[PDB]
Design a protein around this ligand. Structure first.
Ligand SMILES: [Cl-]
Ligand SMILES: [Cl-]
Ligand SMILES: [Gd]
Ligand SMILES: [Gd]
Ligand SMILES: [Gd]
Ligand SMILES: [Gd]
Ligand SMILES: [Gd]
Ligand SMILES: [Gd]
Ligand SMILES: [Gd]
Ligand SMILES: [Gd]
Ligand SMILES: [Gd]
Ligand SMILES: [Gd]
Ligand SMILES: [Gd]
Length: 258
């Protein structure tokens, strides 16, 4: 009577209440990933944590604008311009630019991914932060498409451990969205994963994304309990906290009864 009974079979997603100074945005770490390696990123262990065993290239913090949309250059008669993938044709040209003289299959350097100078043709990145629901209820995260391989995980001990955002990745493969590139071809669009969330709790959020060749795409959305959709720009929803491994009360295993 007096209190709610709590989610059945302790099924609530673990959340956190970090006591430190909140910073807007997610942290992005970048790791080496080999041009044309179409197999490493097809393994769950790699996408959950193995990526951090490869050389770390760099990081940028405070990112609220998180969708990925990387276009290779077309070296054309009029200069070098990024080619939207749907405008690529033949062997090859880019609509409105004529024939492109450069290879689709080499590494290209760009600051497209969050202003960090790297090779978006071949890289793995890890986005970490906390999602703050403004409303209690069911949230549906989605990737509109995945080019090449990606996962999204939400929850304490699933994305990472509360108040330990900056630690080496945890080994959980219980993904909220599994957008891992299948060994055999495959992979529909609008892959989705739902999480029930309680307003005002901070939910660890990890996205791991990888590309082996040319174009890279990962359009990230969330549908709120109120049926509206937030896409690309998660300002106001995603935050970072410096690690505090000594904050004893930081983990809230069951927000339904806290
Ligand atoms: Cl370009
Ligand atoms: Cl053309
Ligand atoms: Gd964007
Ligand atoms: Gd932007
Ligand atoms: Gd972009
Ligand atoms: Gd960009
Ligand atoms: Gd851009
Ligand atoms: Gd952009
Ligand atoms: Gd844990
Ligand atoms: Gd690609
Ligand atoms: Gd809906
Ligand atoms: Gd944009
Ligand atoms: Gd730190």
């Amino acid at each position: 009577g007096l209190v709610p009974r709590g989610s059945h079979m302790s099924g609530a997603t673990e959340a956190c209440l970090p006591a430190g100074q909140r910073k807007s945005g997610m942290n992005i770490n970048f790791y080496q990933y080999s041009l044309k390696d179409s197999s490493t990123y097809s393994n769950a262990a790699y996408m959950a944590y193995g990526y951090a065993s490869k050389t770390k290239l760099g990081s940028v913090g405070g990112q609220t604008d998180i969708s990925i949309d990387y276009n290779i250059p077309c070296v054309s008669s009029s200069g070098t311009f990024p080619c939207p993938q749907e405008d690529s044709y033949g062997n090859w040209g880019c609509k409105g630019m004529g024939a492109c003289s450069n290879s689709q299959g080499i590494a290209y350097w760009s600051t497209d991914l969050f202003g960090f100078y790297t090779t978006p043709t071949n890289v793995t990145l890890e986005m970490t932060g906390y999602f703050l629901p403004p409303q209690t209820g069911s949230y549906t995260f989605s990737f509109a498409t995945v080019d090449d391989s990606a996962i999204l995980s939400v929850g304490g001990s699933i994305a990472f451990e509360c108040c330990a955002q900056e630690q080496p990745p945890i080994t959980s493969t219980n993904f909220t969205i599994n957008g891992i590139k299948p060994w055999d071809g495959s992979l529909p669009d609008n892959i989705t994963g739902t999480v029930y969330m309680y307003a005002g709790y901070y939910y660890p959020l990890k996205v791991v994304y990888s590309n082996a060749v040319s174009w890279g795409t990962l359009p990230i959305s969330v549908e709120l309990p109120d049926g509206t959709t937030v896409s690309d720009n998660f300002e106001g929803y995603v935050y970072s906290f410096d690690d505090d491994l000594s904050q004893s009360n930081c983990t809230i295993p069951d927000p339904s009864i806290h």
